[model samples]
Target: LVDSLRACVFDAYGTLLDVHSAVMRNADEVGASAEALSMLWRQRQLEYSWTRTLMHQYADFWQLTDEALTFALRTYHLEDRKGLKDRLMSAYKELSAYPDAAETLEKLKSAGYIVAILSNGNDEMLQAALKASKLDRVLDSCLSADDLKIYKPDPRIYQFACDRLGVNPNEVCFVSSNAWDLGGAGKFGFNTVRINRQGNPPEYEFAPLKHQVNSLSELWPLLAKN
Candidate 1:
């Protein structure tokens, strides 16, 4: 166990929830482009956030999401279909949760750990997704980068979440599916866990991952280790 660990702060998208499920839900309309479109949307969204952060220009994630989808539509030559874009954007508001998300949060809550989200998702996006997925019932709080107007891998955002949680960074276990996010949190002083759901290759070290698990279902056992 991490000594004095009092809170478990999780990354919302791609960690607890399925971001690609938004496209999956609209597959019929998206047709064969569904999978590739989803990847492009995700890639652009992430890149936009990081690029904006580096440029010192801040836009809420929801706007970036919309822009990312637009870029994806253009790339796939589906720009004329406004309905598809709207449907995909709407679907994003209520993304599906991983099967283990709520159960994992419930267990952590029952174990007396403060379980909350520290995500790049804006408040509206987070709330809608959480409510739709029924994870709102288990989470203690959901903190977003909206407050700081910055994105992850930026130290300020991680510190902002820790400050909001009212815990020392070292006393919080920051769990994220994105290695980049984990790198930022770990560098900022938190013990980090990488939930590598996709079984991707390891990253060049920034801060060492204290733990790695394939899914939220594997989280408890790893934390239980002395």
Candidate 2:
């Protein structure tokens, strides 16, 4: 929230929207090991994106999420259930926002800063998530990876937001729960903030961060400065 910031860009899935809620809500159907499934799903989902980007096997985030869920379900011995993927994906469409997300974005919007989601999610998935989180009305736009057909930690994806938001990268405050993404955006000249919810150790490989916060609610003060 640097005062120089004309826009604030966010990574959606884990940063703004809760990624585990989909599997947790259907735990009765997926079994008591549902948390395991949820974690694996997210792990595999990120792995697929990174590997695919390296190997040049690009797929939309929806397909990537489904593929990751398939891997997770198979691991849990729950792959054979009919309509399972559909149910899980449907639940994803209903993901709830993280506690601080709505108020954070609303605060930024009210303060006259441009706000947006720059996520790896496909357009449809992003749309559903925004509405479910009640963040659709708060956001200026949801920028999907579908448009670029590539996943993040890539500088171009970050540039896409700067392009559409009509600002230089340094004028945008990029925030995410993902460390690598924060690093990438910072490298690309954004004023980056990493929300380190887990108190993870420093990621030495990424570029430096301008700020670090435990949650979205803490972003205001940083932006209040130039």
Candidate 3:
């Protein structure tokens, strides 16, 4: 196994930012418990991302978020809630990072590895999210799908990040909380790591992740050895 990674690319939502906060912040307005709503909203959002990618039916992340939120509301039979969907949309701007994220990024940068976010979020949304989470300073750059007008699992988006980073796919390691995203980055020839925060098994086809870590704290050791 490769012990150290020189450059790291991160997926925004689950890998770094707490996407569930956005769902929970608007949950009461939707007449749903925050925990319950967060679960449904996240699941639907990811499902939409994958399905849209497979079907070649692309929607911006913001639109997919709203669509997923609506689906969650409908699933929970909370359609009567007023302005709840809008609240959920607005909450994205306020999402925070996982507790260990900033420190780990700082550690990686201090250790001399280049770090950037490769996200499905648009440029504006990604900026807002990074700033809100106080992660902007530690990051070297942000690469967004808005440039390609498509979502991830799209090779173009991966190429875009490689172009901006001026690194070959093999020289960069991509980290994501989503299994399929790891698979996508792997297919694009980048070394891929899955955060696996939820402890889910890797999909059969996405096997052989470069690393499967529960938190960023575990990543420092892996990189240090490299």
Candidate 4:
């Protein structure tokens, strides 16, 4: 599997970057409902994207993120709190990377694999995040859904990344922590690996994950072993 693979494409949020870290950064202001808000925020963000994709009403990741935050804020009765919304959005622009992200990417690059990002995040958000986390130095490229105006599980976006990377779907190793995203990439014919940083249970359908790793640090070794 390793020998046949030409590119290692990663999912941006949750896989490499800490999506919940945005709320952590503003935890002081968010108070006790911080965790609930963050969870609801992410849930709505993904729900909006999935709903919009099906409805043929496209919105960029950033806009959907803002809209999700609005919903979460309203649910928590925090919508009128001065500038909290602005602060959280700003924090999201530069969300913290997982401790293993840079090392994993650097290792993959040195091993002669093309390391890149294929994300639902727009170009601006992905750029800001990679730069802030310093993962930009190791990545070969960053591809976003902003250009196609569609979300994952659609197959075409995954196809677009393979096209840009100049690899067949079978030759691309798609890595993601999100089960649904992994399902999409897997069903698209890429070799899929689940970065189970959250210890999620095995998915029941459409999640054709070829491998699983507890962290990015284990990825290279897993590939090398095969």
Candidate 5:
């Protein structure tokens, strides 16, 4: 008995967009295994977001991205790898969308649900990633945290999305690949949907996901129910 949702807000990086592919494709030049490096980088990036929020540190995503990359290289014993940092930074702008993304967005849009992306990426980074993936046209809006100079898990970021959409937090179904983000948005009052694309368990406190699916392919059906 899921109620109708007026809009769908998506977490950009791993939900609709396949950011890992960009990292993996550039791994060779970065002197690391694609799989290993991508995992470590993502883990650290998330860790920084949560830890920063808890500590009230408040750094932008660009800073977090560099810090995570540096940690990944050092943790993997690849420190001093020439030009690795630049290569990783370049990859961020070249991310591709998951195969099902465009079609699913089309379905959701045609079904009369407003679709938007809410990301920790800076404006330029978000724009490049969306345009590169050809997902820019499908999205009704792309919201970034650039102006705020802080990352997610911050209630302000969630509020920003809700305010820009002109919808009540409850009317928006926030779909995020990251469990922490799902938890944050849920706590912020959005009807949170965990995309569970990585097959990880949802945080215990983040109970009763409005919907859980492996990919955006299942999103249309869930939205259709509303």
Candidate 6:
């Protein structure tokens, strides 16, 4: 399948950056269980995006992230000091990259594949993440949902990527740690791969995923090594 691929589009949040690491870093200040907050915060963040997308009301990823954090704070009855929110958001600026991320992207880039980030993250957030993860060097393009005013699992978002790459959907390799995202990309005709980092069970209903692997490094055997 790698032989037929032109570009590889990666999801930013959990796929590239460890989203919970932020909350874990500031757990004491937030006065909540970092694990629980991370789960709920992510859930609400995604829920808001999906709901707003359905209502045809749009908010950028930053705004939605802030809203989700505020909701999580309120749930824990934690006080938000002047720098608290800033500190939490700052965690996002320096997220921990998966062990294989750098090497995986590097291998792909060296192999003549166009590597890009197709994320719900806006330009600013994507830039920060790339620099922090040291992935900016390998990232050929960073496409944001802000430009489209729509979030993932939205078929049109995938369409925009195909249009940008000037390739048919099947020619792009869409990879994500997000199950729903994997499904959505597959539904749009991309060769979708689930980076199943958690060893989670198979998805019963979302979209059909073409491949699944435990780490990005494992992809090389299927890709470059062939």
TM-score of each: 0.96, 0.93, 0.88, 0.96, 0.89, 0.94
Q: Write the per-residue lDDT of candidate 5 for residues 104-139, one digit (tens) a residue.
A: 988888778889999988878788888888887888
lDDT of each: 0.89, 0.86, 0.81, 0.89, 0.81, 0.84
What residue pairs clash in candidate 6, if any at all? none
Cα lDDT for residue 8, model 5? 89
Q: Clashing pairs in model 3? A: 3-226, 4-226
Q: Write the per-residue lDDT of candidate 1 for residues 1-226, one digit (tens) a residue.
A: 4456888999999999999889998898988888999999999999999999999998999999999999899899984569987898899999999999999888888888899899998999999999999999998889999988889988998888778889998889998899888888999988999999889998839698998889998988765524
Worst 10 residues of 3 by lDDT: 23-32
159-212 per-residue lDDT for model 4 (tens digits): 899789999998889898988888888888988899997697888376567888
Per-residue alpha-carbon lDDT of candidate 6 for residues 63-165, written as tens digits (9 for 90 to 100): 8988998887677666664467789878976788888889989999888888888999888877888898898898888899999999988999999998887
Worst 10 residues of 1 by lDDT: 217-226
Please give the distance, in angstroms, between residue 81's alpha carbon in candidate 2 and its true position after superposition: 2.8
Q: What's the residue-level lDDT of 196 in candidate 2?
A: 83
lDDT for each residue of candidate 2 in 1-226, tens digit (9 for 90 to 100): 3266688899999899987789877888887888888999999999999899889989998888889988888888875455778899898877889899998898888888899889999989889888877898898878987899888988889888888888998788888988888888888889888888889987836588888889889987766533
Off by over 4 Å in 4: none
How many residue-pair clashes does candidate 6 contain?
Answer: 0
Of 2 and 6, the candidate ranking higher by TM-score: 6
- Count of clashing residue pairs in every prediction: 0, 2, 2, 0, 0, 0
Worst 10 residues of 5 by lDDT: 201-210
Name every residue pair that clashes in candidate 1. Answer: none
